[PDB]
Ligand binder design. Structure first.
Ligand SMILES: [Zn+2]
Lengths: 55, 167, 121, 66, 166, 384, 90, 242
């Protein structure tokens, strides 16, 4: 049926791609929802997700 | 470690056996889209680019206006400027051009004068520029980077590659 | 009185009240001191409009603290009954919050008024 | 004279379409336009924004549903 | 030509006599910037001459307020009057390095034979003096600078805000 | 150790000029300040302490042919010598313009930024200088004119005959003596107290520039296109005190160190040479792949540095002695260094030391030109 | 040190294996070798979160393991999952 | 989560901050005035061995502290250490300056700078419960107006939103920042250039630092906490940027 209708296929594709992007890079969604529950997924000490200015 | 010892141990081995840093992906990028390059653009000029432009008689600023149908702010870094200088007397015309009041110069705190390396770093870091060149090695490295438009000079006027909105 | 410091003149008041009614219509506006403070806490506020003749002035004067703490523009307008008309409710309102939403038709207006408020601050 | 006549025409056409803001009545901002501006002016988007619909597809359907 | 400089401190004013001048063109160079950092070379460039301590906490506070607003206080007026030589008020004025452009004019209109300076060079000298701090005072008795700063900061801020026991 | 510590280049002044530098004028009063000017028509007033620029005026439609830096003596008022400096550009499109610059030297006040006055000319001007302690400038176009700051019409006419005049320079002491260089390859001394030209010498090729020296008050040195710099006494112009030799294309500018004993020359070959007033051969050669056609050279008022304007559009600045770091030196180190210098002056001519301290690397163009020039001189000499 | 050692060792092992206490949590993949130092502690609310986040008095257990016991949905999920994993093992 | 669960503290990579593990982790700093939480944050307490004493901790709320968000994203060289004197530009209230105080400890000082008067007043109160902070209620564009009060900081942290941010930072770093110093900048693109976008604003501001003689070291876009923000960590080099 996603071939019977075109824009339906594009709609579903866009939703799937939105999710996969949320996997690739942290995406901003609102902010804090309730009270600060805590970083639900874990803090990693030794990762350093930042871009370094080389010489 | 004799030769027969090594052969025997290889035989026995066969018989027996049978802080980090991972840079964040830019917040500009849809999967390869780079939704942060809206007109007026910012083009990092390169030495090869200046010289080929002189060869094919296309103005810099009006040429990029033609190619993109937008405004293009061109920028020349210190290693690009110094490379033209060292090129020397035969390229006096390219330098009197590149040293134009409209080519705004962005400086750098980096070692030596190797514009390739210096450029590739800029675009690894920021992803709001578009690189201009005709250099094959730099072209390959910049294509390897995702979502960085590449404006070469070719034919009779500039061509642009990874812009979704070439038109 | 400098307690209500940034007080809009006639023209800025016009555009402020107009965008306030627009947001009330597209339902991007929270009306009242308490709900305004709630949006302020949640960090969803594009900016804040207050009355300038409240009886007395402190009851809403509490807001500028949170506003200029969290970098949210705020501005006073002369009359609370005017603000109530602008909001579109039967009773005088004293403080309203224009929230933030990317999928809004009045985007460019809110951004113009917020621009001028920031300049005035 | 050609620039003045044709340019003023183009700018007022875009300003009345709504693509271009009032304060940018200059051909330079015309050069700064984009596809998202034109799509934002389309009708289905405007229904969804003004709130008569719940999604962009709800809006599309309504429009064609009369 | 930077003959003297003035340095304000939480516990009073200091005045230094510049002995040598760092070269003016080379100032952006690694070598002269390092000699500003090091203490051995800063002593060769500067020797302290005068130091007027503040009377008490209140006097220090109001003096800091007047420095902020850019005025000259009675104490500063006195110390400058004492230290600075009287040259001709028409030729060869005496050069004093201060920290505040807006302080310049007041000092002038009080002492028309002095000329204030706030350059790259004078700002470098102020920076070096601030960096080394107490080592430069040859042992002249000064209060603990850090405690002085905490007290002075608190008093200054409470003064501006109008903090209240009510 | 000298050879392994020689590091001349110390840095350049901002982003430079668009179109090659042709006018440089140091401020003889202060020490940060110089004024440069370019064939674009754009003149800039540099603060060399920070390698920055105070302003940058687009002065003229054509070239800027001369710059002087000064303070006028107006009779309308007294312009503040402490808050502002003044600068004087002499253009090819028949104008002379007087500009103000807002200078941060003192912090002693708190409008009137640029182009205080303009002096229309009848000819195209070609060089400029300003008699000091008098606020009186002189401009060489088709006939050198003595102008005053307050009168828009050239006050006095000085000219031997009907020849244009390439360049001028007042002298430092006995300040009414002016010397000038004209394009019928002539050098003409003027005096201003009698208000007249004084004498004339004609050489075989045109002299590009002249500098008096600031310690002897009757010696000058002329950079001359026959690859040479001729050092003359004023009172006896029949012969040159000395000839400074080691260039390989037209010499373009000279300057005396304020101490009065060294000369710095820049040529149309792309190099800089430093000479001592008594020798007649180069002490030192400065050269870069990025510097070309040195057109202007100015030696600094602390005698320590050299500024060089070159037509690739850049104003570089170099150390006068390639060793002397600017930091302050502990007395022990200072004594050791002076002892070094005395010892090597003593043993200067021993073959090993001479080989080592004369080995300096020179561009291949200059090496080859030098051997060719030696061949030609040998040829001339033996046919003679 | 080596008092309260058994309880603290259980809590540490539980934290190391926290990825499996919930079918809905899905933590990031980290190894978490035991630190050289630590100090287990209490969380203290503000007075203003008495309904939202304040916990209880009778649900206050002196150890994360025993409060995990006190919770019930966890208990039934655990016993179920253990049942089927055992029947697949057998 | 809830204020009953039992947590396991641990040292972070950066000296002075700690990780509280549990069913879900947290970022914490040891309190300095134990017994009070300056802005209503859930706050851990442990016991330290005369009866043992109670040591109290506090939780960073990453959606409230830009520095907290930066830490959690992961900054290689943060310049705030447990003994250093830190200048703080733009402390509206204790919401993050108190935590920087808790991480510099009892030795190092913290010069809080603010402009307005109401958050200044509450900053005074917090700063008088805390010894390290000295509060200054002078404008941050006039270091000469408050130069009596600060000496030779080790690093400046910057959270002013003003468009002339980089000029402010340059003034204050030149005047008070020790050489080879640390600078941390929090950039909000909308509030600098509202028209052009965030990557452009970042690249521009980075070049302005590279101009004012700070060699930038790293750059972090702190997403899942704040939208289109950045913090740049750089080193004041003051002598040979090259
Ligand atoms: Zn570079």
């Amino acid at each position: 049926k996603d071939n019977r209708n075109s824009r339906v296929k594009k709609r579903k594709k866009y939703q799937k791609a939105q999710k996969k992007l949320k996997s690739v890079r942290a995406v901003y969604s609102g902010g804090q929802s309730g009270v600060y529950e805590g970083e639900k997924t874990g803090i990693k000490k030794g990762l350093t997700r930042s871009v370094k200015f080389k010489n | 470690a004799k030769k027969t010892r090594k052969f025997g141990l290889v035989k026995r081995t066969l018989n027996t056996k049978k802080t980090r840093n991972i840079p964040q992906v830019s917040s500009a990028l849809f999967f390869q889209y780079n939704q942060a390059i809206k007109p007026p653009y910012q083009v990092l000029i390169d030495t090869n680019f200046i010289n080929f432009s002189i060869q094919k008689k296309v103005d810099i600023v009006r040429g990029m206006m033609d190619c993109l149908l937008a405004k293009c702010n061109p920028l020349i870094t210190d290693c690009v400027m110094a490379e033209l200088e060292k090129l020397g007397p035969k390229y006096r015309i390219a330098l009197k051009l590149a040293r134009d009041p409209r080519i705004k110069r962005l400086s750098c705190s980096h070692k030596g004068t190797y514009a390739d390396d210096c450029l590739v770093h800029r675009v690894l870091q920021h992803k709001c520029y578009i690189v201009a060149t005709n250099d094959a090695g730099l072209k390959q490295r910049i294509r390897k980077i995702p979502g960085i438009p590449l404006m070469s000079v070719g034919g009779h006027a500039y061509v642009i590659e990874k812009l979704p909105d070439v038109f | 009185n400098p307690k209500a410091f940034p007080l809009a003149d006639a023209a800025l008041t016009q555009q402020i009240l107009d965008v306030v009614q627009q947001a009330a219509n597209l339902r991007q506006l929270k009306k009242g001191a308490n709900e305004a403070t709630k949006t302020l806490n949640r960090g969803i506020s594009e900016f804040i409009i207050m009355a300038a003749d409240c009886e007395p002035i402190e009851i809403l004067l509490h807001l500028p603290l949170l506003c200029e703490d969290k970098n949210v523009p705020y501005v006073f307008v002369p009359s609370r009954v005017a603000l109530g008309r602008a909001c579109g409710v039967s009773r005088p309102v004293i403080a309203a919050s224009i929230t933030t939403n990317d999928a809004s038709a009045i985007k460019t207006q809110i951004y113009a008024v917020k621009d001028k408020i920031e300049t005035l601050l | 004279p050609k620039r003045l006549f044709e340019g003023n025409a183009l700018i007022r056409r875009l300003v009345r379409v709504g693509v271009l803001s009032e304060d940018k009545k200059k051909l330079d901002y015309v050069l700064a336009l984009k596809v998202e501006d034109f799509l934002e002016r389309r009708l289905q988007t405007q229904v969804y924004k003004l709130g008569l619909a719940k999604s962009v597809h709800h809006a599309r359907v309504l429009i064609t549903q009369r | 030509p930077i003959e003297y400089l003035l340095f304000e401190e939480p516990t009073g004013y200091a005045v230094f006599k510049v002995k040598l001048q760092q070269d003016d063109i080379g100032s952006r160079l690694k070598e002269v910037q390092e000699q500003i950092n090091d203490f051995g070379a800063f002593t060769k460039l500067i020797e302290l001459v005068s130091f007027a301590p503040f009377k008490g906490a209140a006097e220090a506070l109001e003096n800091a307020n007047d420095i902020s607003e850019g005025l000259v206080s009675e104490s500063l007026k006195a110390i400058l009057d004492l230290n600075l030589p009287k040259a001709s008020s028409k030729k060869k004025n005496i050069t004093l390095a201060i920290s505040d452009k807006n302080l310049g004019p007041s000092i002038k209109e009080e002492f028309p034979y002095v000329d204030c300076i706030s350059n790259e060079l004078a700002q470098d000298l102020i920076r070096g003096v601030r960096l080394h701090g107490e080592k430069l005072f040859k042992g002249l008795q000064s209060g603990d600078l850090e405690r002085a700063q905490l007290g002075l900061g608190h008093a200054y801020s409470r003064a501006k805000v109008k903090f209240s026991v009510q | 150790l000298e050879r392994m510590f020689a590091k001349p280049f110390v840095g350049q002044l901002g982003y430079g000029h668009r179109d090659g530098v042709y006018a440089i004028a140091k401020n003889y009063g202060s020490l940060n300040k110089l004024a440069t000017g370019s064939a674009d028509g754009v003149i800039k007033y540099w603060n060399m302490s920070t390698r920055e620029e105070f302003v940058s005026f687009k002065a003229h439609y054509g070239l800027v042919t001369g710059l002087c830096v000064t303070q006028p003596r107006f009779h309308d008022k007294k312009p503040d010598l402490k808050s502002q400096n003044f600068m004087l550009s002499c253009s090819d499109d028949k104008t002379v313009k007087l500009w103000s610059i807002n200078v941060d030297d003192y912090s002693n006040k708190n409008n009137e930024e640029g182009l205080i006055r303009t002096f229309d000319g009848e000819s195209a001007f070609q060089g400029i200088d300003s008699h000091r302690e008098n606020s009186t400038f002189a401009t060489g176009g088709a006939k050198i004119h003595l102008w005053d700051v307050n009168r828009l019409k050239p006050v006095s006419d000085l000219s031997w005959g009907a020849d244009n005049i390439t360049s001028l320079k007042f002298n430092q002491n006995e300040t009414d003596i002016l010397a000038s260089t004209g394009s019928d390859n002539s050098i003409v001394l003027y005096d201003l107290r009698t208000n007249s030209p004084t004498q004339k010498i004609v050489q075989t090729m045109r002299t590009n520039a002249i500098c008096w020296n600031p310690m002897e008050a009757f010696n000058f040195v002329t950079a001359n296109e026959d690859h040479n710099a001729y050092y003359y006494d004023m009172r006896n112009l029949s012969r040159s005190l000395n000839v400074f030799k080691d260039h390989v294309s037209a010499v373009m500018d000279v300057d005396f160190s304020p101490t009065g004993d060294e000369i710095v020359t820049g040529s149309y070959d792309k190099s800089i040479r430093i000479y001592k007033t008594n020798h007649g051969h180069s002490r030192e050669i400065y050269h870069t792949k990025r510097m070309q056609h040195v057109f202007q050279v100015k030696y600094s008022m602390d005698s320590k540095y050299i500024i060089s304007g070159s037509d690739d559009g850049n104003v570089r600045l170099w150390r006068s002695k390639a060793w002397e770091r600017s930091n302050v030196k502990t007395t022990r180190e200072k004594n050791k260094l002076e002892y070094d210098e005395k010892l090597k002056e003593r043993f200067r001519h021993m073959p090993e030391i001479k080989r080592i301290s004369r080995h300096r690397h020179v561009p291949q163009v200059i090496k080859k030109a030098q051997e060719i020039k030696n061949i030609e001189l040998s040829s001339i000499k033996r046919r003679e | 040190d080596d008092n309260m050692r058994r309880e603290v060792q259980r809590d540490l092992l539980l934290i190391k294996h926290r990825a499996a206490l919930d079918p809905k949590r899905h933590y990031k993949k980290q190894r978490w070798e035991v630190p050289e130092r630590f100090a287990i502690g209490t969380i203290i609310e503000d007075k203003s979160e008495f309904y939202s986040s304040r916990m209880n008095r009778k649900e206050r257990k002196s150890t994360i393991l025993e409060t995990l016991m006190g919770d019930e949905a966890s208990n039934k999920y655990f016993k179920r999952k253990y049942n089927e994993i055992q029947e697949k093992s057998t | 989560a809830r204020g009953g669960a039992k947590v396991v503290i641990e040292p972070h990579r950066h000296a002075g901050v700690y990780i509280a593990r549990g069913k879900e982790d947290l970022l914490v700093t040891k309190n300095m005035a134990p017994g009070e939480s300056v802005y209503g944050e859930k706050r851990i307490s442990v016991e330290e061995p005369v009866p043992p004493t109670k040591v109290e901790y506090r939780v960073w709320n990453p959606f409230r502290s830009k520095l907290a968000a930066g830490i959690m994203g992961g900054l290689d060289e943060l310049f705030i250490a447990p003994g250093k004197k830190v200048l703080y530009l733009g402390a509206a209230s204790g919401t993050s300056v108190s935590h920087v105080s808790d991480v510099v400890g009892p030795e190092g000082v913290v010069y809080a700078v603010e402009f307005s008067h109401r958050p200044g007043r509450e900053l005074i109160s917090m700063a008088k419960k805390r010894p390290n902070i000295i509060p200054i209620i002078e404008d941050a564009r006039h270091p000469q107006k408050y130069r009596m009060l600060i000496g030779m900081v080790d690093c400046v942290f910057a959270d002013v939103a003003q468009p002339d941010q980089a000029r402010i930072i340059a003034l204050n770093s030149h005047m008070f920042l020790k050489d080879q110093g640390g600078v941390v900048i929090s950039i909000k693109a909308n509030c600098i250039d509202s028209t052009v976008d965030a990557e452009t604003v970042f690249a521009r501001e980075v070049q302005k630092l590279r101009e004012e003689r700070i060699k930038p070291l790293e750059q972090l876009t702190l997403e899942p906490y704040e939208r289109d923000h950045c913090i740049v960590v750089g080193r004041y080099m003051r002598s040979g940027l090259k």
